[PDB]
Amino acid sequence: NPCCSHPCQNRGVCMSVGFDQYKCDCTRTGFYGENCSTPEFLTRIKLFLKPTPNTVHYILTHFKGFWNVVNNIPFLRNAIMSYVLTSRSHLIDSPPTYNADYGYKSWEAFSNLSYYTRALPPVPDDCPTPLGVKGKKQLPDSNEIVEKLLLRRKFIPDPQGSNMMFAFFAQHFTHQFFKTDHKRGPAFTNGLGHGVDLNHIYGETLARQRKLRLFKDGKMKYQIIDGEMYPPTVKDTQAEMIYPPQVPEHLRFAVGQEVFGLVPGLMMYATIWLREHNRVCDVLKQEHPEWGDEQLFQTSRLILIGETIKIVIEDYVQHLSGYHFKLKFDPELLFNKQFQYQNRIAAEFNTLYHWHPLLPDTFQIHDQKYNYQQFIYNNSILLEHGITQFVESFTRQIAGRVAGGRNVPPAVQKVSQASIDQSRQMKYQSFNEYRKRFMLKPYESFEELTGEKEMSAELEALYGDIDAVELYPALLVEKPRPDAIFGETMVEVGAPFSLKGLMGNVICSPAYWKPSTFGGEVGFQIINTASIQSLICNNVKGCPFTSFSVP
Amino acid sequence: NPCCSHPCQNRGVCMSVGFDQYKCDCTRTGFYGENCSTPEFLTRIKLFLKPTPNTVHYILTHFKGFWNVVNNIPFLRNAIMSYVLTSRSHLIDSPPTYNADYGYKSWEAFSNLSYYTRALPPVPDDCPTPLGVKGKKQLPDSNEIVEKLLLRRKFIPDPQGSNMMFAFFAQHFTHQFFKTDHKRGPAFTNGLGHGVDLNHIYGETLARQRKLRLFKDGKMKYQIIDGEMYPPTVKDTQAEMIYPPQVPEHLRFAVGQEVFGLVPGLMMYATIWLREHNRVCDVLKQEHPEWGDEQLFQTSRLILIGETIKIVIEDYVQHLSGYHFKLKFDPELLFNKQFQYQNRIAAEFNTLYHWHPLLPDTFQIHDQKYNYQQFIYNNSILLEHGITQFVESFTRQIAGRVAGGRNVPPAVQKVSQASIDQSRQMKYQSFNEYRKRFMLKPYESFEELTGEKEMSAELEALYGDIDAVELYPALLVEKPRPDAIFGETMVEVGAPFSLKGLMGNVICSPAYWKPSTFGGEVGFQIINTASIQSLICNNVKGCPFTSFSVP
Ligand SMILES: *[C@@H]1O[C@H](CO)[C@@H](O[C@@H]2O[C@H](CO)[C@@H](O[C@H]3O[C@H](CO[C@H]4O[C@H](CO)[C@@H](O)[C@H](O)[C@@H]4O)[C@@H](O)[C@H](O)[C@@H]3O)[C@H](O)[C@H]2NC(C)=O)[C@H](O)[C@H]1NC(C)=O
Ligand SMILES: *[C@@H]1O[C@H](CO)[C@@H](O[C@@H]2O[C@H](CO)[C@@H](O[C@H]3O[C@H](CO[C@H]4O[C@H](CO)[C@@H](O)[C@H](O)[C@@H]4O)[C@@H](O)[C@H](O)[C@@H]3O)[C@H](O)[C@H]2NC(C)=O)[C@H](O)[C@H]1NC(C)=O
Ligand code: COH
Ligand code: COH
Ligand SMILES: CCCCCCCCO[C@@H]1O[C@H](CO)[C@@H](O)[C@H](O)[C@H]1O
Ligand SMILES: Cc1ccc(Cl)c(Nc2ccccc2C(=O)O)c1Cl
Ligand SMILES: Cc1ccc(Cl)c(Nc2ccccc2C(=O)O)c1Cl
Ligand SMILES: *[C@@H]1O[C@H](CO)[C@@H](O)[C@H](O)[C@H]1NC(C)=O
Ligand SMILES: *[C@@H]1O[C@H](CO)[C@@H](O)[C@H](O)[C@H]1NC(C)=O
Ligand SMILES: *[C@@H]1O[C@H](CO)[C@@H](O)[C@H](O)[C@H]1NC(C)=O
Ligand SMILES: *[C@@H]1O[C@H](CO)[C@@H](O)[C@H](O)[C@H]1NC(C)=O
């Protein structure tokens, strides 16, 4: 296949013409020529006036005195936030295009929701090398890559101070749209909503939802233990959950997501959100005594969705970005813009979000310290200590650094390898191709990627060519930004995926973004004043202080 | 329920506040006040400059010499067509809101694709009257409505000259997204693509598609009969079709849509589009001898989708409108506008497209006249005459006028009654409520609606109040425009749904609307030069003259 070398630059579409020739479609790329590499006049100018991401990142992470002024001038904050949203939006194809089985546009790829979509097309089948034309005939041994480059020798804490509240929020939140269907294969998903629908609370299907609902006051089923509200059982709901035989019947908590019983950190947030839903039902009941159970349930769901997006932007992304600028969740910022209120989850977004290095060596709850074997599938620990003690402890324990290499816990060594192996059967293009796909300069050397000497040497011994380095491994060994959890690429690729999934949500559209949608101003206000602190304060006994970073 | 009165005007959202009070959400309506009835300053002006639809219709259907010059100046033609598209589209909620089960915004209503969506929410369950407050406690007998107002005494031909080519095209085309799942109920659909995906050619599911495909050269299965290409059999494809047991196996043609064997007219268009698909495969193979079966199939499908939208706008809607202005299919007209490339089929769109009056008393092919009992499920008629004779004959046979009342063939009486019964199951608001929803002044009397005395009287005897008249019966008895097939409402309500369904298609989005999407410029040119005449000329022996109007 002549398109194996990925000849078309700047988002140009490559098409074969006969057996030995190809053609590049430069339509609306701002470039022309055989490979869409010659800039148009207007393009030369725009390229000359674009700051580098590292320049812009510097600006947003310094001058705290300046940003403190900007954050308190609504007009400016709105203007800045508007830029942040729109300056990235042009990097996501919407409606979506390719998937694992289609490197050309097709109705199958567009219409079949069981697939993850793809930011870059899959490497064609019969190519000289797995990645196209660069690199060796065979990719390096995946286990060898994990051990030499990814495995933790000594715990590397996150310099930004991200804690376990953050790490488990990241996992809980993203696992509502990262639901890989490993029956079919890594290219397929079970989250047909393809975004923030809160299916991990309410269930992916109506059948599961009816098993989880109380059908009184709009609320979700629950049980009281030691005066505290917890999720219901599988026995009570008949809602299937993933549990080992060793887990007794009365400890098989049923929640929206079948796998959230795997780890107590997930069951903590599931409990918190469950409580929040029933709390909002009580508020709405007070406001609307004429409302029935169905409308109480549906309106509460729409509110929690709003809370979720609110919290993710203004607390979660806020902490992750390290910006002194105060991010703002406000759908009105897009009402005068060209924006598509739809989204399809990208397989690469999933891959890049394998933040295994976040995980500590042991989990520390109160006085106790649990290893992975003791912590996994253990709702006893949740009942023993309680949510309050969980929050206090998770807020204090720091997470591991994601970029910079060699920080993956040996306990999840198999999962790290799987991420590499699964990236290969989905035929991912190289790291540098994804750099270019998101307006970044390709690395010219291994040393430029890692910013050090020995890991880069290992990469060269394994891959040989810098253009042969794979997406997932490179993201984890990439040179971090100064005192940051990530490197340049992780942010520049992830941010557009993330913002698209948040602002693209239907509740953000002008027809939905109204008080009547959420039951009136009281309901609308719950969204617009939501925070990770208030979420905990409203639903966790004692109202403990919490944050996404260690104090 | 205080909202039974439909108090909120101008797209305002009604919400109950306690048992006896309500509240209107006037957000972004352009109006304010308790009822969203008081216009803002800009709105006050906008309404003043906006011409009435009857005026605009007059200007587009007269001054034939003036439009002749506008049509040949691309700057003017593009600008006008652009306004046509945008001015209509703002009347459609996208992403979609209500369905038959939800008169308030809910995630269930948004996410469940099995429902038709709703331009107006259902009438609340427990209201004084079926339509809310207006009208009698019980709606008139649906059979009495059909007999008095809708049944055809004597055939009334369409003044616009619509022929059977047009009638069967309307039926064939619209039945890809009007696929009511009566198993579940009238509120539900089997077309989860919710638009122009040509599932009626290729099948809804991948399983049925694989049954119809040849898996060589990207082609669809077929058989040759008298030198001419026809659809394959059920026995060969194992694709389910709906046929009475008395139909012999060799006459059981298998096509994408299960019901198209019902009438030869549909099976005619199914055969033509089948031929076109296999024709485009031959064209693409010449351009791409390096391509495989899968890519040839998928690319052909995308091209036929383009042809359909092209033909619908510049031939079908062009004839239907009666405009002297030449409508244009050009996705680039929207690339600088705010527009959502998504759509959800509205139940009301389905209802207003029950154009039963189009049907003739008998079907006239060559020298023979077939009644309904003769014509239904009779594919032997198709083979006897051939597609060419079908095209020649149907082009010449006049269709019935749709508006004006009393033109529904008694043969389909029970179908017309079902339209009324079903719309009542789904709790449609009144005809006047749908007029106001689409910026039309509500009718003051029955006489203003029909423009005459006889049907007016029978209407008042049945409904009592003008605000009690139902959508479907009113559309068919409405005073038709001068020498036109429809009345005002049908167009002003139908056109937004239609254009949104056409331009909202994914292939019209900037990422898709490129030559590379369609296999290069040769494929792209197939779309952009498509017409109903070229579709016939390329696939029907002898290249017979055809048109959507009688010669
Ligand atoms: C879009 O909306 C449609 C209309 O609301 C949804 O269709 C409806 O789906 C529900 C649930 O799938 C279905 O109700 C069925 O619920 C009963 C379930 O209870 C039984 O299930 C357990 C299973 O182990 C069993 O032990 C017991 O028998 C327990 O009682 C079914 O048993 C029963 O047959 C009933 O049909 C509705 O019938 C169905 N409605 C229609 C009109 O089709 C549709 O699911 C939704 N689409 C989504 C959410 O994707
Ligand atoms: C999105 O894409 C997915 C991947 O392409 C689609 O999943 C695939 O779906 C097909 C069928 O829907 C499935 O094929 C399976 O069908 C075989 C049966 O074939 C014969 O068997 C019956 C027996 O009665 C016969 O009557 C039929 O006529 C037919 O000739 C199975 O035996 C076999 O297991 C085979 O796998 C694929 O497995 C499946 N692939 C994956 C990876 O899941 C998915 O359907 C699509 N989503 C849509 C269209 O909504
Ligand atoms: C912040 C990100 C994050 C965290 C904290 C986290 C925390 C933990 C954790 C904590 C105790 C455990 C035991 C695991 C273990 C697993 N994770 Co994650 N995971 C994370 C991101 C992901 C993602 C993303 C996937 C793929 C999701 C999918 O496709 O369903 C994943 C998949 C897995 C799988 C599937 C294996 C496979 O073959 O793909 C296992 C097992 N893991 N992970
Ligand atoms: C231009 C529009 C048009 C035409 C010419 C047309 C011509 C014909 C025709 C010609 C020989 C026949 C035998 C019928 C007979 C039927 N029509 Co139509 N129909 C049309 C638009 C529709 C639509 C739209 C529906 C509802 C489709 C759905 O919900 O799936 C429909 C429904 C039906 C049904 C379903 C039963 C019911 O309860 O509604 C039958 C039977 N009919 N119609
Ligand atoms: C958890 C400990 C990981 C064991 C890694 C075994 C594979 C050898 O890994 C080696 O380890 C050395 C010391 O870290 C590095 O300096 C080398 O670059 C690396 O290749
Ligand atoms: C605008 C901006 C800036 C910095 C980060 Cl870290 C993000 N967010 C992410 C970056 C990389 C990967 C994931 C995310 C995320 O939002 O989840 C955003 Cl959206
Ligand atoms: C712009 C315009 C003008 C006139 C008609 Cl008739 C249409 N088309 C329809 C009008 C009413 C009902 C249906 C349609 C249609 O396109 O099918 C359009 Cl889109
Ligand atoms: C870019 O075009 C040149 C000739 O214009 C060609 O030799 C080269 O192969 C193209 N790029 C790639 C990566 O092949
Ligand atoms: C849960 O933790 C307890 C400690 O209280 C331990 O004894 C038990 O083995 C664990 N159960 C698991 C991991 O299933
Ligand atoms: C608004 O309309 C409702 C319709 O029933 C009416 O009861 C009410 O008096 C109106 N209020 C106004 C016009 O202020
Ligand atoms: C079907 O049409 C044929 C002519 O092609 C005719 O002989 C036959 O009687 C028709 N069938 C019915 C049931 O009328």
Side-chain angles (χ1 to χ4, degrees):
Chain A
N1 193 323
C3 286
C4 279
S5 60
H6 315 294
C8 305
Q9 311 301 294
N10 295 120
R11 311 274 295 286
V13 181
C14 185
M15 180 188 66
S16 66
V17 175
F19 295 96
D20 51 12
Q21 281 186 340
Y22 70 94
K23 179 152 188 176
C24 289
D25 195 345
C26 302
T27 299
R28 247 116 50 204
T29 64
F31 293 78
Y32 60 97
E34 180 174 3
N35 306 331
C36 312
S37 45
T38 305
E40 290 175 358
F41 190 83
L42 194 75
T43 305
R44 294 185 185 272
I45 311 304
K46 296 181 70 171
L47 272 173
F48 184 72
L49 305 180
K50 284 216 195 211
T52 65
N54 290 341
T55 299
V56 186
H57 175 87
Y58 187 96
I59 308 193
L60 290 154
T61 56
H62 294 76
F63 314 107
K64 188 183 289 186
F66 168 79
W67 291 113
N68 267 275
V69 179
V70 174
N71 295 335
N72 278 112
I73 304 174
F75 166 76
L76 287 180
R77 189 192 177 198
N78 291 336
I80 301 298
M81 187 62 196
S82 189
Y83 173 76
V84 171
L85 289 178
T86 54
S87 67
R88 303 183 176 276
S89 35
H90 81 275
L91 297 170
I92 306 301
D93 292 333
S94 192
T97 56
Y98 313 113
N99 64 31
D101 288 334
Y102 294 94
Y104 53 91
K105 277 84 171 186
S106 73
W107 198 261
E108 181 61 28
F110 161 73
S111 76
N112 191 332
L113 303 178
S114 288
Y115 287 93
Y116 287 112
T117 198
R118 288 281 286 271
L120 275 179
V123 178
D125 296 278
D126 210 275
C127 286
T129 73
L131 292 182
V133 298
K134 292 300 193 73
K136 305 182 177 66
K137 188 186 89 289
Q138 296 184 23
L139 291 173
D141 189 274
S142 57
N143 183 73
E144 187 172 357
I145 291 173
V146 168
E147 292 190 342
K148 287 179 162 289
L149 294 168
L150 301 185
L151 281 189
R152 174 179 295 160
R153 319 291 208 264
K154 177 178 183 291
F155 177 75
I156 304 176
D158 171 30
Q160 289 189 232
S162 308
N163 57 19
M164 287 297 102
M165 288 294 292
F166 174 85
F168 281 122
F169 184 94
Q171 188 181 15
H172 184 267
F173 169 67
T174 62
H175 276 42
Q176 79 187 281
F177 45 74
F178 293 152
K179 289 163 52 171
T180 318
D181 189 348
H182 293 282
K183 294 179 300 182
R184 294 185 195 264
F188 302 89
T189 178
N190 286 319
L192 306 182
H194 280 270
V196 187
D197 53 16
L198 303 207
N199 71 78
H200 61 333
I201 292 169
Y202 299 113
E204 177 71 30
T205 68
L206 181 69
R208 188 170 176 86
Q209 180 192 116
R210 292 180 171 182
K211 287 175 175 173
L212 294 176
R213 282 176 58 181
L214 183 62
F215 290 102
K216 177 194 176 193
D217 298 336
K219 296 187 178 178
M220 299 282 286
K221 289 180 72 65
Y222 63 92
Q223 60 183 317
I224 301 292
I225 305 174
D226 305 322
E228 308 267 36
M229 175 182 298
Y230 288 97
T233 59
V234 172
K235 178 179 189 171
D236 181 23
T237 58
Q238 297 301 311
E240 290 182 0
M241 291 290 296
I242 306 298
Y243 281 117
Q246 310 88 51
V247 175
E249 205 175 18
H250 63 281
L251 289 180
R252 307 209 202 203
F253 296 158
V255 296
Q257 240 281 31
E258 290 83 345
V259 306
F260 279 2
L262 169 76
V263 33
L266 289 176
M267 191 57 59
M268 182 199 63
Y269 274 112
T271 299
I272 291 174
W273 279 111
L274 176 69
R275 292 177 181 179
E276 175 59 16
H277 177 101
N278 289 345
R279 193 190 67 84
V280 174
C281 282
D282 290 331
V283 171
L284 288 174
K285 162 74 85 62
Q286 183 68 21
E287 295 294 322
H288 300 275
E290 76 287 4
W291 275 10
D293 163 78
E294 184 67 11
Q295 186 167 17
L296 281 167
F297 172 78
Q298 300 293 353
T299 307
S300 292
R301 175 164 196 172
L302 292 184
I303 289 173
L304 267 65
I305 290 176
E307 293 179 32
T308 298
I309 299 174
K310 172 73 173 192
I311 292 170
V312 168
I313 291 176
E314 299 199 4
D315 285 322
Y316 178 88
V317 176
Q318 180 68 53
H319 159 67
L320 195 55
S321 73
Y323 291 170
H324 291 141
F325 169 68
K326 190 185 171 185
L327 303 169
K328 186 190 183 190
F329 171 53
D330 185 11
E332 295 192 16
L333 288 178
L334 291 179
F335 286 174
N336 63 333
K337 304 287 164 54
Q338 285 183 309
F339 186 75
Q340 296 294 312
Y341 293 102
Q342 53 176 114
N343 188 44
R344 196 77 63 83
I345 302 296
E348 297 99 338
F349 191 33
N350 174 73
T351 294
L352 116 218
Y353 232 112
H354 290 207
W355 296 350
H356 305 137
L358 280 177
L359 298 176
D361 295 331
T362 63
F363 299 91
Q364 299 152 28
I365 314 291
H366 194 57
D367 293 319
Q368 295 289 99
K369 282 169 165 224
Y370 310 90
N371 58 51
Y372 282 75
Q373 212 68 28
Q374 297 171 324
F375 196 68
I376 243 64
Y377 284 113
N378 219 321
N379 291 324
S380 298
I381 306 176
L382 192 67
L383 291 187
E384 182 182 2
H385 297 277
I387 305 297
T388 300
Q389 185 62 62
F390 257 65
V391 172
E392 293 176 335
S393 300
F394 282 175
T395 306
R396 287 192 301 255
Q397 182 168 10
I398 195 171
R401 191 182 209 173
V402 174
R406 295 172 182 173
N407 203 28
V408 170
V412 296
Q413 180 178 344
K414 291 293 185 60
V415 182
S416 184
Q417 181 184 15
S419 307
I420 302 177
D421 291 334
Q422 287 168 11
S423 290
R424 291 174 177 186
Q425 42 180 138
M426 286 191 297
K427 300 269 194 174
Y428 277 21
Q429 286 186 44
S430 73
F431 182 70
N432 266 336
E433 292 306 323
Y434 278 103
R435 294 266 303 175
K436 294 193 280 187
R437 170 59 178 82
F438 288 90
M439 303 278 292
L440 300 186
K441 311 286 287 187
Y443 288 118
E444 296 183 29
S445 69
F446 301 87
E447 183 170 337
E448 189 186 345
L449 166 68
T450 65
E452 52 81 81
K453 286 295 184 183
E454 50 175 306
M455 286 191 301
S456 52
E458 296 292 337
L459 280 168
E460 184 171 337
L462 288 163
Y463 287 108
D465 194 340
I466 182 63
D467 288 322
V469 181
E470 291 164 279
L471 179 61
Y472 169 77
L475 284 171
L476 296 187
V477 305
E478 186 182 26
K479 174 180 173 183
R481 293 233 177 98
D483 294 316
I485 192 170
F486 298 147
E488 175 178 44
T489 309
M490 180 74 86
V491 174
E492 293 300 309
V493 174
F497 285 134
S498 171
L499 293 178
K500 178 61 171 168
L502 295 166
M503 300 311 296
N505 192 280
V506 56
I507 74 165
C508 295
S509 65
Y512 276 73
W513 194 241
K514 305 171 174 180
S516 54
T517 300
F518 313 104
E521 301 289 356
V522 172
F524 203 17
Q525 180 168 339
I526 296 181
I527 293 174
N528 289 314
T529 65
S531 64
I532 186 62
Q533 176 63 86
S534 72
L535 180 69
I536 269 62
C537 189
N538 283 322
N539 301 289
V540 182
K541 177 182 183 65
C543 181
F545 168 81
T546 190
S547 168
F548 283 144
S549 69
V550 297
Chain B
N1 191 344
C3 291
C4 282
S5 153
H6 313 296
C8 306
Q9 303 296 115
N10 302 294
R11 307 289 305 285
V13 188
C14 191
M15 175 184 61
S16 65
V17 182
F19 294 92
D20 58 278
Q21 305 172 41
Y22 69 93
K23 165 63 178 186
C24 290
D25 191 348
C26 302
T27 300
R28 284 185 295 278
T29 59
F31 292 75
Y32 62 93
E34 181 186 0
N35 279 339
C36 311
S37 294
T38 317
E40 294 172 357
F41 185 69
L42 271 66
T43 308
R44 182 71 182 184
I45 296 155
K46 286 183 181 178
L47 290 179
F48 186 80
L49 280 309
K50 171 172 172 58
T52 70
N54 282 326
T55 291
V56 177
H57 178 261
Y58 178 92
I59 303 175
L60 288 165
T61 56
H62 292 66
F63 310 105
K64 198 171 180 178
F66 165 76
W67 288 114
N68 221 271
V69 7
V70 178
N71 291 342
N72 288 274
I73 305 176
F75 169 74
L76 297 183
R77 186 193 177 199
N78 290 337
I80 291 182
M81 187 62 194
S82 187
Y83 184 77
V84 169
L85 295 177
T86 58
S87 63
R88 299 275 180 190
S89 293
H90 90 270
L91 294 167
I92 305 299
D93 290 319
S94 190
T97 56
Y98 312 112
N99 63 29
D101 278 338
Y102 294 97
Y104 55 88
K105 274 74 165 191
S106 77
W107 193 263
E108 181 67 20
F110 161 73
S111 71
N112 192 326
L113 303 172
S114 296
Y115 289 86
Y116 288 112
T117 199
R118 289 280 285 270
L120 281 180
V123 173
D125 298 275
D126 190 18
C127 287
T129 64
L131 299 175
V133 301
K134 293 282 194 161
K136 309 177 182 177
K137 195 232 180 179
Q138 234 149 13
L139 289 166
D141 191 275
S142 56
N143 187 75
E144 183 164 1
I145 297 173
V146 176
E147 289 188 351
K148 282 186 167 62
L149 302 177
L150 307 183
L151 281 190
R152 168 183 295 163
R153 323 299 204 249
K154 184 152 55 60
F155 180 79
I156 301 177
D158 171 31
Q160 295 188 223
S162 300
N163 57 17
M164 290 297 101
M165 279 287 116
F166 169 85
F168 284 120
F169 187 95
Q171 195 183 356
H172 182 266
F173 168 64
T174 59
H175 270 51
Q176 77 187 285
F177 48 77
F178 297 147
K179 315 207 300 161
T180 322
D181 186 0
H182 302 274
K183 183 190 301 299
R184 314 180 81 157
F188 298 96
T189 178
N190 290 119
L192 306 183
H194 279 269
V196 184
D197 56 13
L198 304 207
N199 72 83
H200 64 331
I201 293 169
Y202 300 113
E204 259 287 310
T205 72
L206 182 67
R208 182 175 185 87
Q209 177 191 123
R210 290 182 170 179
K211 284 168 170 152
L212 297 174
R213 282 178 61 181
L214 186 67
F215 291 102
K216 179 185 176 179
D217 295 330
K219 289 182 176 168
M220 296 275 280
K221 286 189 177 181
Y222 62 91
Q223 54 182 338
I224 306 297
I225 303 170
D226 290 282
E228 296 276 50
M229 174 183 298
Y230 286 92
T233 61
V234 169
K235 179 184 181 185
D236 176 36
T237 66
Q238 296 302 133
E240 281 176 30
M241 293 287 299
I242 300 179
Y243 284 109
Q246 56 268 23
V247 171
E249 275 183 349
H250 69 282
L251 291 179
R252 296 170 185 252
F253 293 123
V255 292
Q257 162 71 279
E258 295 78 3
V259 312
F260 278 175
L262 172 64
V263 33
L266 291 178
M267 188 54 62
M268 182 207 62
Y269 271 117
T271 295
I272 293 174
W273 281 109
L274 175 70
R275 291 172 181 183
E276 178 59 20
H277 175 91
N278 283 351
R279 188 191 69 85
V280 175
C281 281
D282 288 331
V283 177
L284 290 169
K285 184 168 197 64
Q286 280 293 322
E287 292 298 310
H288 299 279
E290 77 286 356
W291 277 7
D293 164 81
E294 181 68 9
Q295 189 169 8
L296 284 165
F297 169 78
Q298 297 296 348
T299 303
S300 295
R301 175 165 190 171
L302 290 181
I303 287 171
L304 260 68
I305 291 171
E307 297 180 27
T308 304
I309 298 170
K310 172 70 164 192
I311 290 173
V312 165
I313 293 179
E314 301 185 7
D315 292 313
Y316 180 85
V317 178
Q318 182 69 58
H319 159 73
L320 195 57
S321 68
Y323 294 174
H324 290 323
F325 171 73
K326 196 194 292 175
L327 302 172
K328 180 186 185 194
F329 173 50
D330 186 14
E332 295 186 5
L333 297 175
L334 297 180
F335 289 175
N336 57 331
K337 300 297 188 302
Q338 284 183 309
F339 189 79
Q340 303 293 308
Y341 293 101
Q342 62 179 99
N343 189 49
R344 196 78 65 84
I345 304 295
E348 297 98 339
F349 194 27
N350 181 28
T351 298
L352 100 239
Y353 237 113
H354 283 245
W355 296 351
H356 303 143
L358 278 176
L359 298 183
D361 293 334
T362 55
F363 299 87
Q364 302 155 15
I365 307 170
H366 197 16
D367 304 280
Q368 303 182 50
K369 289 165 62 64
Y370 301 98
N371 59 65
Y372 284 81
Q373 278 298 330
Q374 293 177 307
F375 197 60
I376 289 301
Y377 281 121
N378 202 340
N379 286 329
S380 81
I381 298 180
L382 192 69
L383 294 181
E384 179 186 354
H385 295 282
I387 301 292
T388 300
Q389 183 61 65
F390 255 69
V391 172
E392 290 174 335
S393 299
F394 284 170
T395 300
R396 297 190 203 108
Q397 180 169 7
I398 190 71
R401 193 181 209 180
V402 180
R406 291 168 181 169
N407 206 28
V408 173
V412 292
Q413 166 179 3
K414 266 150 53 261
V415 181
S416 182
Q417 182 184 347
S419 296
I420 300 173
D421 294 334
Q422 289 174 1
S423 75
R424 290 175 182 180
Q425 298 178 48
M426 298 183 295
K427 290 118 68 191
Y428 281 12
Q429 288 179 41
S430 85
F431 177 71
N432 267 338
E433 289 307 310
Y434 276 102
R435 292 206 74 207
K436 294 190 291 186
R437 168 62 174 81
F438 288 85
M439 292 192 68
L440 302 182
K441 180 183 174 181
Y443 284 131
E444 311 277 14
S445 66
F446 303 96
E447 289 178 329
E448 187 188 350
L449 168 65
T450 65
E452 49 77 79
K453 294 300 189 67
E454 298 189 358
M455 291 184 296
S456 303
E458 301 203 90
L459 267 171
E460 186 169 354
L462 290 171
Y463 286 103
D465 191 335
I466 182 60
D467 292 318
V469 185
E470 302 171 85
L471 178 61
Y472 169 76
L475 286 167
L476 269 52
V477 302
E478 187 182 27
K479 174 185 174 183
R481 291 248 180 81
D483 295 291
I485 194 175
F486 294 141
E488 176 183 44
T489 306
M490 183 79 80
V491 169
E492 299 301 313
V493 176
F497 291 119
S498 165
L499 293 178
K500 178 60 171 163
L502 295 167
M503 299 309 299
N505 190 285
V506 56
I507 73 170
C508 298
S509 68
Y512 276 72
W513 187 246
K514 307 175 171 188
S516 55
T517 302
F518 310 104
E521 289 293 351
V522 176
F524 203 24
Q525 182 78 329
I526 293 177
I527 294 172
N528 285 315
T529 67
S531 74
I532 190 66
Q533 178 61 92
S534 68
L535 176 68
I536 267 57
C537 196
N538 290 331
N539 302 291
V540 183
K541 177 182 187 180
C543 188
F545 177 88
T546 200
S547 173
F548 284 144
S549 75
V550 289

